[PDB]
Structure 1
Amino acid sequence: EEDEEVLYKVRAKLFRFDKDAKEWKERGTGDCKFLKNKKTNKVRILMRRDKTLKICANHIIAPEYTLKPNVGSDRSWVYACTADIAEGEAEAFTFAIRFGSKENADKFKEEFEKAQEINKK
């Protein structure tokens, strides 16, 4: 956070997909940030919950990830993450992330892809 440049920031609500149960469960609401390491040039997603400030997302924006639409929403994305360490130990998740608006959703995707090309270099 000290050795990191904030490339993008948007307020979001993040969900994880419970497979066992057949439902999306909310994982946090707050500022979703795109952080670029000044020393490694790697770009991650870092999201913390409001008030608590507890980390609810912490993963590299891997080049291989793809933002897919959700059948219920025009202001959300869904994608498979293979290495999120918000809870501590690296774990696979199917994330969904919803925004205040379609504009906000679209701006995120664009930024998301820009970050991916950075992580390619």
Structure 2
Amino acid sequence: HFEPIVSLPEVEVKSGEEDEEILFKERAKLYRWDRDVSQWKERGVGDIKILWHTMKNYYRILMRRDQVFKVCANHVITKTMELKPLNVSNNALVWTASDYADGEAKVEQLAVRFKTKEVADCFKKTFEECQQNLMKLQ
């Protein structure tokens, strides 16, 4: 029907995961804390993953939205992380992180809710194991 207005040649797609190993990948919902209104606002729904690099040897939490495939959470794991269960609700975790999703660092309290409880337990165990591996390197 309508004639084209702009022609774009096909380009290669490079996602920063070729040289990293996926130690975890599960469906989840990510919520960001909104201090101005003091209520949780949905940040997205998608596959949250805990990637680990081989040479640089760093652990990175990554997440992409469902259909648009935008990055809704992306940060590094540090010994100062305080992942802990959320008293209200169930099978949910909360932690503060210097998220680098949109355009720059922002200190955000992220709450992740999984489908069931065993998945959340596995995620917490992997998080703790990554923290311990980072700490023991010293």
User: Into which bin does the TM-score normalised by the smaller protein fall?
Assistant: over 0.9
Residue equivalent to 1:70? 86
Pairing partner for 2:119 from 104, 107, 113? 104
Do residues 15 (structure 1) and 41 (structure 2) align?
no
Gaps of 5+ in 1: none
Q: Secondary structure at the match of 1:74?
A: coil
Task: Kindly indicate whether the alpha-carbon contact (under 8 Å) linking 1:42 and 1:118 is maintained by their aligned counterparts in 2.
Answer: no
Gaps of 5+ in 2: 1-16
Do residues 80 (structure 1) and 96 (structure 2) align?
yes
Residue equivalent to 2:41? 25
Residue equivalent to 1:95? 110
Q: Secondary structure at the match of 1:66?
A: coil
Q: Which fold has the larger relative contact order, with Cα–Cα distance below 8 Å and residues 6 or more apart in sequence?
A: 1
Residue equivalent to 2:130? 115
Distance in 2 between the 1:105 and 1:51 partners?
23
Pairing partner for 1:49 from 65, 84, 89? 65
TM-aligned CA deviation for residue 90 of structure 1: 0.8
Question: Partner letter of residue 41 of structure 2?
Answer: K
Deviation string 1:45-71 (CA, Å, 9 cap, x unpaired) is 000001111101111111111112223
Q: Report the TM-score when normalising by structure 2.
A: 0.82
Question: Partner letter of residue 20 of structure 1?
Answer: D
Q: Secondary structure at the match of 1:52?
A: coil
Distance in 2 between the 1:73 and 1:57 partners?
22
Count of residue correspondences: 120
Structure with larger Rg: 2
Task: Kindly indicate whether the alpha-carbon contact (under 8 Å) linking 1:6 and 1:33 is maintained by their aligned counterparts in 2.
Answer: yes
Q: Secondary structure at the match of 1:73?
A: coil
RMSD of Structure 2 on Structure 1 (CA): 1.1
Deviation string 1:63-98 (CA, Å, 9 cap, x unpaired) is 1111122232221011111x2111120110011000
Q: Percent identity?
A: 49
